[PDB]
Amino acid sequence: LSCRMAMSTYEAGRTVLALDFMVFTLRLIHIFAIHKQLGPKIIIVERMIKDVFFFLFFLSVWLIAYGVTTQALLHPNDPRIDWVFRRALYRPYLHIFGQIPLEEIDAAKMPDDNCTTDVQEIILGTLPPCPNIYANWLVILLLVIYLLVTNVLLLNLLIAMFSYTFQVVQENADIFWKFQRYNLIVEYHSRPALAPPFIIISHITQALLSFIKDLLERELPSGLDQKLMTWETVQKENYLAKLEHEHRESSGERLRYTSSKVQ
Amino acid sequence: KEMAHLATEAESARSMKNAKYEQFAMDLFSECYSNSEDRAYSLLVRKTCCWSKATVLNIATLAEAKCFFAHDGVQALLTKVWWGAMRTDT
Amino acid sequence: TFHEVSKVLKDFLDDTCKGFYQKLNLPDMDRRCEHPWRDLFLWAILQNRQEMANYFWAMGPEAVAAALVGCKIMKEMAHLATEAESARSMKNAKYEQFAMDLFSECYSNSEDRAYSLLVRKTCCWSKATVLNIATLAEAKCFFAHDGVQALLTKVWWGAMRTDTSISRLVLTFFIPPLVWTSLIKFNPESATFIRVVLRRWNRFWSAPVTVFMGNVIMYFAFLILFSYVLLLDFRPPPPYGPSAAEIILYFWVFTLVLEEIRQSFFTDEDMSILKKMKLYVEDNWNKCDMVAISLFVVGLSCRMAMSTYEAGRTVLALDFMVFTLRLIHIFAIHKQLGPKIIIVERMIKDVFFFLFFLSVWLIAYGVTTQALLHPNDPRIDWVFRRALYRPYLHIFGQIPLEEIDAAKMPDDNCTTDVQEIILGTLPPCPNIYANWLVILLLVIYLLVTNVLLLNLLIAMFSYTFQVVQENADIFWKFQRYNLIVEYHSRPALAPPFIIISHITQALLSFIKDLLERELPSGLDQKLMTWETVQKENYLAKLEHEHRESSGERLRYTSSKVQ
Numbered sequence: 051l052s053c054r055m056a057m058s059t060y061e062a063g064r065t066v067l068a069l070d071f072m073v074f075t076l077r078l079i080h081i082f083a084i085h086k087q088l089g090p091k092i093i094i095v096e097r098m099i100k101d102v103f104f105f106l107f108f109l110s111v112w113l114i115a116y117g118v119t120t121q122a123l124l125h126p127n128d129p130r131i132d133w134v135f136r137r138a139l140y141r142p143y144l145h146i147f148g149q150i151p152l153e154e155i156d157a158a159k160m161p162d163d164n165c166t167t168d169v170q171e172i173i174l175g176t177l178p179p180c181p182n183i184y185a186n187w188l189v190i191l192l193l194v195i196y197l198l199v200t201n202v203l204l205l206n207l208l209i210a211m212f213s214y215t216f217q218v219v220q221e222n223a224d225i226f227w228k229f230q231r232y233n234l235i236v237e238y239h240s241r242p243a244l245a246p247p248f249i250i251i252s253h254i255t256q257a258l259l260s261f262i263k264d265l266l267e268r269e270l271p272s273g274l275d276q277k278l279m280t281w282e283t284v285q286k287e288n289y290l291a292k293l294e295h296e297h298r299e300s301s302g303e304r305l306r307y308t309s310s311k312v313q
Numbered sequence: 314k315e316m317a318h319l320a321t322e323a324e325s326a327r328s329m330k331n332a333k334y335e336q337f338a339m340d341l342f343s344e345c346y347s348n349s350e351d352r353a354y355s356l357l358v359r360k361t362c363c364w365s366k367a368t369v370l371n372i373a374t375l376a377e378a379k380c381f382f383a384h385d386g387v388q389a390l391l392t393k394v395w396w397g398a399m400r401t402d403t
Numbered sequence: 404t405f406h407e408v409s410k411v412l413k414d415f416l417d418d419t420c421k422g423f424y425q426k427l428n429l430p431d432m433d434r435r436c437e438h439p440w441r442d443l444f445l446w447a448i449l450q451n452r453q454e455m456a457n458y459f460w461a462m463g464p465e466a467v468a469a470a471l472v473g474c475k476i477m478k479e480m481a482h483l484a485t486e487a488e489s490a491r492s493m494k495n496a497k498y499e500q501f502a503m504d505l506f507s508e509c510y511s512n513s514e515d516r517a518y519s520l521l522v523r524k525t526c527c528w529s530k531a532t533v534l535n536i537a538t539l540a541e542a543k544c545f546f547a548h549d550g551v552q553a554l555l556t557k558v559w560w561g562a563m564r565t566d567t568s569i570s571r572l573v574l575t576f577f578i579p580p581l582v583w584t585s586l587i588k589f590n591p592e593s594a595t596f597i598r599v600v601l602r603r604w605n606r607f608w609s610a611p612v613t614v615f616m617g618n619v620i621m622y623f624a625f626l627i628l629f630s631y632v633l634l635l636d637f638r639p640p641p642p643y644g645p646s647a648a649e650i651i652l653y654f655w656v657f658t659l660v661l662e663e664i665r666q667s668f669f670t671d672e673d674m675s676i677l678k679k680m681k682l683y684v685e686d687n688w689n690k691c692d693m694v695a696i697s698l699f700v701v702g703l704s705c706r707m708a709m710s711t712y713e714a715g716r717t718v719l720a721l722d723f724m725v726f727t728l729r730l731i732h733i734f735a736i737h738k739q740l741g742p743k744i745i746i747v748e749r750m751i752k753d754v755f756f757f758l759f760f761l762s763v764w765l766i767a768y769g770v771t772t773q774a775l776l777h778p779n780d781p782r783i784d785w786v787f788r789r790a791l792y793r794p795y796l797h798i799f800g801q802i803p804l805e806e807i808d809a810a811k812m813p814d815d816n817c818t819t820d821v822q823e824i825i826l827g828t829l830p831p832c833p834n835i836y837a838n839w840l841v842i843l844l845l846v847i848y849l850l851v852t853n854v855l856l857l858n859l860l861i862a863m864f865s866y867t868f869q870v871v872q873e874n875a876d877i878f879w880k881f882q883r884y885n886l887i888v889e890y891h892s893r894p895a896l897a898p899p900f901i902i903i904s905h906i907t908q909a910l911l912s913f914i915k916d917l918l919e920r921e922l923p924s925g926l927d928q929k930l931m932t933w934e935t936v937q938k939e940n941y942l943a944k945l946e947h948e949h950r951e952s953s954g955e956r957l958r959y960t961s962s963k964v965q
């Protein structure tokens with residue numbers, strides 16, 4: 051909004067507000083904690099992130115290699131740095147999602163466009179540069195190998211990682227969701243009773259009452275507190291006695307007793 | 314769990330990780346919940362005298378005892394709090 | 404004669420059993436053995452007698468080394484095994500398990516004598532360190548032990564405390580004067596001030612982790628410089644000169660070659676030159692680097708001439724890929740990034756299976772459709788294009804129906820004459836005699852390849868990942884040990900600077916360790932006795948837990964009640 055109030059930064063303000071809408075929308079993920087089916091998925095996504103980081107390291111290495119190699123082989127005379135980075139990382143990254151523009155990589159499929167080789171004309175953007183087709187069989191072979199590796203090996207390996215991580219996490223994810231649901235319930239327990247923009251009313255009321263003047267964490271009378279302490283102690287004794295009893299009648303203890311007694 | 318992070322020798326750290334003191338709390342509270350189920354809630358929400366007026370839920374938050382919060386009794390109390398004066402089966 | 408047993412031991416170990424019996428050239432027959440239990444264990448081991456060999460191991464002075472040697476000999480003999488039963492028993496030798504359990508007991512006892520046990524020079528095995536024997540036996544499970552990994556972490560962090568945050572290290576590295584500050588903790592132990600500050604500086608910068616991270620950063624710098632030279636400042640042949648940045652790159656790679664030569668001929672001591680070279684080239688990374696160096700040399704040599712200039716540029720560009728892939732090695736140190744490299748290796752074999760199936764089915768479909776669709780195209784390159792290149796791209800969603808489906812063919816200006824087709828004047832007119840067959844075959848191919856084969860490969864990857872996951876951690880632990888050792892031996896300055904360290908080393912050699920240290924006689928004897936006591940306690944614990952096992956209790960009770 052501050053950048054929006056000024057003409058010299060107006061488009062920047064609009065851009066920042068648009069990017070902030072994404073943050074506000076993603077803040078809506080919190081409500082999913084209450085639902086039992088939608089709860090653990092958020093926690094599972096967190097481990098999915100780490101597997102994604104591993105896959106991104108592998109992708110980054112292999113993609114840098116392939117993209118720089120093909121940019122060197124195909125457009126060796128293009129000085130435009132932005133286009134170097136485009137052809138070296140942006141295009142190979144899109145190759146993962148089925149975007150393979152063979153019109154720029156395969157000599158047979160290149161359009162009969164009007165392209166130039168002069169550096170001055172290339173830099174000024176008058177004409178698109180004419181791709182080098184010296185050894186294009188190498189470019190096609192490298193593209194085939196890259197597609198194989200990235201789309202099959204790497205993607206299926208990431209699917210395997212996700213599958214294994216899901217199987218491992220599933221048990222602990224429910225416990226994490228239970229804790230998250232506790233946190234959500236406590237937060238909405240402490241929250242004032244009116245949703246914003248109305249909240250303003252509750253805040254004004256609270257401040258006015260504070261100037262003018264729980265279900266959880268309640269303190270009990272002395273007698274009830276003492277009775278609860280005694281009841282907890284009795285339950286603890288019963289629990290320990292049950293443990294000791296089930297230990298005495300365990301198979302191993304019975305065998306040890308029988309062996310000593312028979313000896 | 315704090316001492317395990319501050320642990321030097323491998324054997325002591327290994328024993329400290331497998332402390333299963335939270336398991337004691339879970340089993341004891343399971344027994345308590347199975348007994349009365351109404352005194353157990355007060356046990357969860359009362360202010361302990363030995364630990365400077367600290368609620369058992371407050372300590373569970375402090376220890377980050379996630380497994381304890383997963384207990385059926387704690388979740389039932391949370392559902393009761395969540396639904397307020399309304400019945401939890403609505 | 405003892406020559407035969409010496410040569411058998413040479414085949415099995417090749418470095419450890421030197422001088423056991425060639426010393427005196429045979430020793431006089433009357434003189435008693437200096438290490439009787441070692442000889443008896445080794446003799447009992449060479450003939451697959453495990454119970455007798457286990458008994459001899461139980462009485463031997465150095466038990467971890469003996470167990471590791473037994474593991475090596477057993478895995479070698481299993482390969483040389485004829486009868487199935489003996490081979491099966493030999494595979495399940497579990498001598499490495501003895502070493503792991505005994506060292507676990509030792510580590511649980513003191514945790515400081517255990518490190519000395521790992522790094523001391525054993526007297527029975529010809530001054531061979533237990534880690535050296537573990538490397539010899541390739542006892543990957545032993546290296547996975549928590550004690551070995553803790554010692555490796557201690558070596559890796561040098562004088563610095565192993566609990567130091569990575570951020571503290573990086574901030575100290577970028578700003579060297581922070582080293583004298585209390586920012587980063589250090590393990591205990593006018594002119595003096597210069598001496599003490601120099602000692603602290605040297606202690607920080609000689610740590611293997613600092614050397615590693617410096618090498619990583621300047622390998623990134625090398626890749627950036629290589630890419631800049633290749634893509635933006637690559638000039639015509641020397642008539643117009645290589646770029647200054649290209650000259651700097653040449654010097655950089657020359658320093659890399661010097662580093663390789665150092666690792667291949669001057670590593671740690673004076674062993675056989677042929678053996679040293681074999682050990683150097685046995686490492687796959689040392690083959691990758693070698694390929695990179697050779698490709699770079701060929702690339703620059705072809706680059707210096709006008710008649711091969713484009714070929715030189717192509718070779719250099721292809722070499723950049725090798726150099727970039729050489730960067731995978733740094734991933735071994737990280738625990739999350741470590742096992743993934745090992746998992747990819749098994750992924751490769753599953754990929755080979757899928758590639759066999761793909762190759763068969765793709766050849767069938769591609770040749771069939773080329774025959775059906777372009778029967779009059781003589782161009783061999785286009786035959787191979789339409790037969791293998793296009794069907795391979797069908798896997799990744801590239802389905803150009805404009806060339807396969809009659810309804811979707813453009814109204815282009817195509818010819819049917821063979822002369823016009825060969826000369827490339829016009830594209831050939833595809834045959835549409837029975838195009839329904841072409842479409843049906845394309846549909847079947849898409850179904851099979853994209854659904855059945857790809858999902859079957861995903862299933863293979865899923866199953867292999869589940870199987871490998873457990874063993875991958877052990878493999879990563881061994882790989883991390885190798886990386887830590889390599890960066891421990893490495894000089895302290897990353898290339899192209901390396902040149903300085905090499906010059907210093909050569910000048911000092913002409914003018915004039917944490918691992919594999921030799922101990923005084925008293926300390927060595929005390930460590931031997933402590934290991935023997937720990938072994939006895941471990942065996943007693945095994946026997947005790949066996950007596951109070953349920954089965955043994957039942958057997959005793961049955962016999963006694965009868």
Ligand SMILES: C[C@@H]1CC[C@@]2(OC1)O[C@H]1C[C@H]3[C@@H]4CC=C5C[C@@H](OCC[C@H](CO)CO[C@@H]6O[C@H](CO)[C@@H](O[C@H]7O[C@H](CO)[C@@H](O)[C@H](O)[C@H]7O)[C@H](O)[C@H]6O)CC[C@]5(C)[C@H]4CC[C@]3(C)[C@H]1[C@@H]2C
Nearest residue numbers: 157158159160187190191762765784787788791792795827
């Ligand atoms: C199962 C597994 C799958 C993967 C793979 O292994 C097996 O498959 C293999 C197959 C192989 C490929 C097989 C064949 C080839 C062809 C070969 O070129 C032969 C040389 C000739 C000549 O010098 C080049 O051709 C001609 O170039 C000219 C460019 O000036 C074109 O002019 C065009 O100019 C303009 C472009 O618009 C327009 O005027 C017209 O359009 C047209 O006039 C011609 O039309 C065209 O004829 C290069 C190598 C390549 C692509 C192989 C690469 C590797 C594979 C994919 C294997 C995999 C590992």
Ligand SMILES: C[C@@H]1CC[C@@]2(OC1)O[C@H]1C[C@H]3[C@@H]4CC=C5C[C@@H](OCC[C@H](CO)CO[C@@H]6O[C@H](CO)[C@@H](O[C@H]7O[C@H](CO)[C@@H](O)[C@H](O)[C@H]7O)[C@H](O)[C@H]6O)CC[C@]5(C)[C@H]4CC[C@]3(C)[C@H]1[C@@H]2C
Nearest residue numbers: 808809810811812813814835838839840842843844846847
């Ligand atoms: C669930 C499962 C999925 C898979 C599958 O099984 C079920 O589906 C089945 C469906 C089936 C297909 C169903 C139908 C057909 C059509 C049939 O042609 C009928 C014959 C007629 C005539 O002789 C051919 O047509 C005409 O050709 C002409 C070519 O000269 C076109 O002229 C064009 O010329 C130029 C081209 O640019 C331009 O001037 C214009 O563009 C246009 O003037 C006409 O426009 C077009 O009308 C061939 C077989 C095919 C493709 C089936 C194949 C198998 C399936 C996919 C099954 C699967 C197993």
Ligand SMILES: C[C@@H]1CC[C@@]2(OC1)O[C@H]1C[C@H]3[C@@H]4CC=C5C[C@@H](O)CC[C@]5(C)[C@H]4CC[C@]3(C)[C@H]1[C@@H]2C
Nearest residue numbers: 110114129130131132133134135136138139140627
């Ligand atoms: C995933 C990483 C993020 C960081 C980075 O690499 C990928 O992004 C790339 C985008 C590049 C930009 C893209 C476009 C232009 C415009 C051109 O007129 C001048 C150069 C410049 C600023 C480039 C400088 C180098 C940059 C930041 C690259 C940078 C290493």
Ligand SMILES: C[C@@H]1CC[C@@]2(OC1)O[C@H]1C[C@H]3[C@@H]4CC=C5C[C@@H](O)CC[C@]5(C)[C@H]4CC[C@]3(C)[C@H]1[C@@H]2C
Nearest residue numbers: 187191762766781782783784785786787788791792
């Ligand atoms: C995966 C395999 C690799 C090996 C191979 O089959 C796939 O590659 C194919 C590429 C083919 C090339 C492609 C282009 C041309 C140009 C043409 O003017 C003369 C013929 C020639 C050299 C062809 C000869 C046969 C070749 C090597 C094929 C060879 C069996």
Ligand SMILES: *[C@@H]1O[C@H](CO)[C@@H](O)[C@H](O)[C@H]1NC(C)=O
Nearest residue numbers: 161162163164165166176177
């Ligand atoms: C390509 O550009 C030149 C520039 O003079 C022009 O003469 C020619 O007509 C153009 N051809 C195309 C493809 O339009």
Ligand SMILES: *[C@@H]1O[C@H](CO)[C@@H](O)[C@H](O)[C@H]1NC(C)=O
Nearest residue numbers: 813814815816817818828829
């Ligand atoms: C196709 O080629 C012929 C060759 O003479 C020409 O006469 C005709 O105009 C061309 N048609 C198209 C599609 O331009």
Ligand SMILES: [Ca+2]
Nearest residue numbers: 663688689692
């Ligand atoms: Ca090397």
